[model samples]
Target: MQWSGARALEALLTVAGELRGPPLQLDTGQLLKIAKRGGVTAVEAVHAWRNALTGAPLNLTPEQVVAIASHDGGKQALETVQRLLPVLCQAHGLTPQQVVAIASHDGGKQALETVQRLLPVLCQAHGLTPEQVVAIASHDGGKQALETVQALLPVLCQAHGLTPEQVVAIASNGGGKQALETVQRLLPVLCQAHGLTPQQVVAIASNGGGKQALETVQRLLPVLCQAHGLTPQQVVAIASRGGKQALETVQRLLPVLCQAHGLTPQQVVAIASNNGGKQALETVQRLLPVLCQAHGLTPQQVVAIASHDGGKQALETVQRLLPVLCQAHGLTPQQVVAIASNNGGKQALETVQRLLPVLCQAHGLTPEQVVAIASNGGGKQALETVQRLLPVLCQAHGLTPEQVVAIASHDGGKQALETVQRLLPVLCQAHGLTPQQVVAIASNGGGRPALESIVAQLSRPDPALAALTNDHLVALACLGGRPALDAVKKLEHHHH
Candidate 1:
């Protein structure tokens, strides 16, 4: 009388086998709940539950049976999952639970068929494990992803030296599978014919349309490097910045960019380094001829602007502001060109536009002198430094403004001045050199090295040619004086 639903049902069926009347122990309410939850009539639920208890061929638990039957298409979905579970576990080592989870996903049943078909192929082709194959299928387009990997895995490994793991990582990107095939097909040519290292090749292929980029690089690298005189490294730098189309853009434009407009390879590389560099290169390519013709910019000046970071923006800014600078600020074209010809000259021009008036009015600098200081390698900073330091040199150290300007105009000019301020007296007193002579030697690009070299050579007093002047010593240092200071041990034995 106290029997559970399952036991009560079993007993009722046993008693009914004798054609006896309905068993009094049957729990009809319990039967109804089981039937409603299982999405079946009471009779169907009793029959299915009995089958489960009697070891029916269906390899599912009672709860799983109820769960499958609960949905409209649960029966078919469950059947599909059960049919493949054992084979997948045996053939691919997938766990029963993992198979269930996959099957539970929409299209998981079809995905299983694709996985099975591809599992062995991936293993044989790439030495991948079942788990590896499973990892690939775990993504969307499960089967397609696997097939793509299988087709391209060999060349990716043999030709590019990419480990299977790295390939997997590449494929993990969106459209990764296609990217691998593209990269693999082009890698042989990119590495052998073109000069890209395998690592750079891999980097291109690892991204979207990486193969497309590789193809463009293959076509452009030789032309850009050989015709335009861009080094392979510089070309690669452009490709690495922009994707495949960027490579094509550079190739298409390089002849015009360098041959007609005179942008250097180094400058092109710098333009490519920034975001939107490819587009910037395109903008610059279109605008260069106009700027040069309209603004009276020489090819050399154009090259300077093209060679800076944000080169395009700098050029654009200069294009808009040059007239303003010339007309409003009263800067001459020669001074403007000179300022634009240095590194970061484009940026420097804008800075100068704002600061030039201040510099002239505050420091009493003539336009010519301002141009001279601004034209140096330090660009705006050089001009600013001259404004700040010229007075200190002229009044305090007895150096003239022209002399200080001359020393500040070249590389190492500023440092030379500082060195001169500190050591000019020391050299004149210790080495018997005139102040004028010391300043002349120190003012050259060699700076402190020139001053120190003269002192060292004179202090030795080796009359070997005690006739060596400070000028000679400074010239030697400028021309690399290490040999003079180095022992004369070389080739002396044969000479003696």
Candidate 2:
């Protein structure tokens, strides 16, 4: 007799309702289509569904019966489910549902066939359960991960004291398996160390050379945390790039890492986490404190200075002058960081600090404007010019530090500024040029020479210089020399 729809619902949903298991993603019509194609009549399939538990030790649940009959493997194995499901269930403990998901994949029957073969040997080897096996087989690159796990599973648990979850996580990733294989011994040893726990070690391993990063963390974390004061989380952060010699340099420099430097272990780890990092903390033991504490520079600022070719000397220069530069001249922390991070920023600060008091004394010479000169370049030359010229320029010559710093802030402008000192002392407001216009003229590049030519050339000098627009003065400075003078003379012609 054929199974009716009423019989189908009563049997399938009744048992499912009793079990309270969620419905299969495979619905009844889909299962019907699946069963229809396999040449199995509706009577045979529903008969299997009705028999989910009535047959002893052959327990395919109601959902599983329909699920088994649901996929392409369902076509081949539907009739065989009675004999097959019981055997795998009794032997390796693969449930009926695991088979369906396994069958859902592309390799079709081959996975199931292989599952029963190698898995039973492995199933008992580490007592690896059916669920864990399915995850390894179904989610990862099935066969290879299977082989890798089979090869490594026993010791990964027993020798390493690995938890089942850690074992599974290790086998879960294909590369992680290779990592476990390479650095097989130190698993639990790393956990016993202070900063890293069992979880972080495996994650680090799973996360490369997996061995390379792990090996470094194992060697470095204890030393950094105990001797140097790294927090556990920072150890993990530093371990992220702990791929190789990154850790080597950290250890090499460890004992003298100078706890006084005020660099949190995490910060140094980040600094030493890689090659760029290694160079920065290398400076720490030697008054990385001086940079961080004395001047309040961040490790990032230290990283900026330490990694440069001139970092060693930069830190030294900063050791002495940076304090005065920051406190005396209003060198803001960020501005000092910019100067320290620049190619020769420290040297600029050196010259600036050397010319201090005189540089700071000049009226209108704001601290920010002077630091601006150092941040870009030309600290010493500009500072020296200020020392020689500021007293003369502001006192005898009547120039301000604001005009001096701005004019000397560039390569061409220092000469222009100094010449302003020389000529202004004599030429003496020859064309009624304001300090701002003087800076604009020097900024454009004609230097003092440009102004000299302009003065010798312009007629009706008072209004001629006064009559030019700010833009015209800028262009006049940019044109410089005869062109500047001609432009000024031309402006005089405009008045005529």
Candidate 3:
């Protein structure tokens, strides 16, 4: 194959002359191999490879070019790649060389053809970007993947509430396009069963093996949550982990752990909410009941361990320390559960456990009382309200502790309490209403309307408004002050 010194020049000049290019300074052995292996005549191989490079930004060497042209079906592959290069290059800002590199993969010609066919559809029909077209082409199973995306994009976008771009994003993850196709197939069933929004379904369906994950969640989440009384939050938490095996792991193990350990559904939900909760549930299936039985701990006590964010480590730590936490630290089972229910629950529990005593002493409340208050709505914010705002409501607003508890229990109430502090006096003075009536309206969740109505009624009080009692007037104001009062007037006339 190695033609001697002069022979190499003769071969190179001969091959170059057919293409009307400058003489190729290539090895005779390389030239012979290209022609022989490509199953094309030497001159035909040279001309086809050279023509393929016309107006192309090619990085392959001349011998490499000839070799590609000469491979089985290489001539057709080169032609397809050449035809697609400029379009892809112009659209994606890719070089001819970059397109060549992509097509150089096995089945690369078919891949280029698929991209060529689908790129227009994806852009015109689905509104995908040129870059997304290039990405899909370059992905593994590029042709099949693009084809799958082409078929699924319309339905996923129009019916499933997914944007074309989000469908593309889901497909863009490696090997996900096929899985995405599967997701589209299963989308309606999964969404209806789990109340999954488009975004939540997308989140689960964009991961590796997304199709299988979607199927797993569809089959398992409803059963897990409904049969066991697990919360939707727990289902979402587990499903977000993203994989078929992960969902399967949770499905297989959740009930097993719940039944064997005598864990309540709430405890099971707590375990399912942790990071790697699928694995945590699997881990707990073997140990949770054993740990509880060995330590004489209740199901709720162990929930603190399972529900924590520390994964398996937190579960183990709580198992080892349950005795000390109860006896030495003087934390009640209820206290531990309350602390662990918050975000970063396990990590913050010890800190809060220590703070509980200091809180009780500084605030002059018992530990159980503090835990009960902290466990309510707004968790920490609610607790802070009890510590600081509780007395303020009592002393400043003349509110009883019970009244303060009712008012500060909700976030709306928490904010209303402060707002009323400012607006209460203004309403009392401006409207000729007592502080008791003002406080009653303020705490009754109609403070804003009550105040606005007081201003309107004082400015323009009719005989009907004057006849109503303070409670009746406040109620009338809540139903939109003056308009409602006029309607009341008409209704009363009708009744008489």
Q: What is the TM-score of each candidate against the true structure?
A: 0.45, 0.31, 0.41
Between candidates 1 and 3, which one is better according to lDDT? 1
Q: Pick the candidate with the highest TM-score.
A: 1
Report the candidate with higher lDDT, 2 versus 3: 3
lDDT of 1 by residue, 1-496 (tens): 2244566676555533322222212344444433444333323433434443224343554444433333333334355555676788876788765555444333344556677777787888678877666666654445566778877787778867988987775564445567677777777788788857777777666554555666778778888788777888777767766667667666677667667767776666666644356766886787778877875687556655655545666677678878998899888767776777555666568767776777778777676766776675555666666667777767776777777767666655556666777776767777666767666676555555666655666777544553445666655655643454333323233454
Per-residue alpha-carbon lDDT of model 2 for 1-496, expressed as tens digits? 1364556656565543332333234455645554554334432444444544335565555555554454444544455555455677766677767765554333334445656666766567767777877765553234555666777876776777667667666555445456666546676666664535667767666543556767777767777677766666766655654445556666666545534444444555655553334544565566565666653777667766654435555666667666676677766667766666554555776766655455566434566666666654445565566656666666665556566666777654457767776555334354455655555666644466676665554434445356565446546655665575565566665556
Candidate 1 to truth, TM: 0.45
- In model 2, pairs of residues that clash are 271-277, 393-399, 416-447
Give the distance in Å from residue 21's predicted Cα in candidate 1 to where it truly belongs. Answer: 99
RMSD of each: 25.9, 31.6, 20.9
Better of 2 and 3 by TM-score: 3
Considering TM-score, which of the candidate structures 1 and 3 is the better prediction for this target? 1
The lowest-lDDT stretch of 10 consecutive residues in candidate 1 is: 16-25
Q: What is the C-alpha lDDT profile of model 3 across 1-496, one tens digit per residue?
A: 2444656667655654454453444555655555565444434645655644543454455644654454445566566666777777786566665576556443567778887777788788777777787767665456777887888878877777888777876786556566787777777876676677777787776655667767777778777677766665566656665256545666666666656666666556666654466656766776666766774556565565565455465565455555676887687655665555544444445445555676567755666655554453344555555666766666876766655555444333445466556666656666666756655555544444455555555556644545565667766755553456556656665354
Superposition error at 150 for model 2 (Å):
72
Give the candidate number with the greatest lDDT: 1
Task: Give candidate 1 misplaced runs (Cα > 4 Å).
Answer: 1-249, 255-280, 289-301, 308-310, 354-364, 446-471, 478-496
- Cand. 1 Cα-lDDT: 0.63
**How many clashes show up in model 1?**
2
